Amino acid sequence: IIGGTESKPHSRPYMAYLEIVTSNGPSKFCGGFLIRRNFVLTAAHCAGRSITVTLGAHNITEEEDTWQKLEVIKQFRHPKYNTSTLHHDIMLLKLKEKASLTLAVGTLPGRMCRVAGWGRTGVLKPGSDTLQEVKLRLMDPQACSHFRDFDHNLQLCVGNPRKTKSAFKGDSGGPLLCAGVAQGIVSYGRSDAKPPAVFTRISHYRPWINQILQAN
């Protein structure tokens, strides 16, 4: 998160910190959010060989009783996910067991929405130890035209280009909440962090989400 504030600790109890393993490189990291006690929603580009989910975190470097480290038993990447266009950048993670409900852990184009994450706080900066959040402007789709594979039906265009405020690397998979309702998932943007960024429009995938949740 660039240009944001430190979240009040545990004020977003649905937030998930994802550590993603691949065979041929070190761990990568993403955000996500708990939508059922045993399901986390995130971005498809956060898929890997295996994933660990930490719920209940604020400072991800300091173990505390709110933490629930949970095994993912299966990844459900959207079947039409495209690695070139990044269309359908959405994935459900089924947890081995249902998370415990605690205070710190529970389930979840001109308006202002909020996104949170542990991602980088600048181009040359590292992932944040603490959960950060930022208020961003929903933009008209023409603001994202320069993303040649942007699609207004599939995606949201998020972040006033006049501001430095943005989701960034490591925030992938985190929710965009507009008046308390999750409308988007951090997907991609520019390497140089110039907003706007592209978010998955969750509404488009409600049928698919429902099918996975009902059948698993």
Q: From the candidates 7, 128, 166, 172, give the one annotated as an active-site residue.
A: 172
Contact between 167 and ligand A1AOY per CB under 6 A: yes
Contacted entry of ligand A1AOY, Zn ion, none for residue 131, CB cut-off 5 to 8 Å set by kind: none
How many whole angstroms separate alpha carbon 103 and alpha carbon 138? 30
- Which residue in 69, 109, 149, 152 binds ligand A1AOY (CB under 6 A)? 149
Query: Residue 169 binds what, of Zn ion, ligand A1AOY, none (CB under 5 to 8 Å, by partner type)?
Result: ligand A1AOY
**Contact call for residue 191 and ligand A1AOY (CB under 6 A):** yes
Rounded CA-CA distance 110/162 in Å is 14
Beta strand 39-42 pairing with 91-95: antiparallel
Contact partner, 66, from ligand A1AOY, Zn ion, none, Cβ < 5-8 Å per class: Zn ion
- HSE toward the beta carbon, residue 58, CA cutoff 13 A: 13
DSSP alpha helix (H) spans, the chain? 206-215
Q: How far is the CB of 89 from Zn ion (least distance, A)?
A: 31
Q: Is 10 annotated in the active site?
A: no
Please return the burial class of 90, using the count of CB atoms within 10 Å of its CB with bins 0-12, 13-18 and 19+.
Answer: buried
- Binding to Zn ion by residue 102, rule CB under 5 A? no
Closest by Cα among 132, 134, 138, 104 to 120:
132
Q: How far is the CB of 51 from ligand A1AOY (least distance, A)?
A: 16
Residue 133 CB, shortest distance to Zn ion, in Å, is 16
- How far apart CA 125 and CA 20 sit, in angstroms, is 20
Q: Which stretch in 39-47, 63-71, 178-186, 202-210 sits in contact with Zn ion by CB under 5 A?
A: 63-71
Pick 34 or 86: Cβ nearer ligand A1AOY: 86
Q: How far from each other are the two terminal CA atoms of the chain, in whole angstroms?
A: 33
- As a 3-state breakdown, the chain gives helix, strand, coil percent values, each rounded to 5, of 10, 40, 50
Select the binding partner of residue 88 from ligand A1AOY, Zn ion, none (C-beta < 5 to 8 A, by kind): none
Catalytic sites, residue numbers = 45, 89, 172
Q: What is the binding site for ligand A1AOY (CB under 6 A)?
A: 45, 85-86, 147, 149, 166-169, 171-172, 186, 188-191, 197
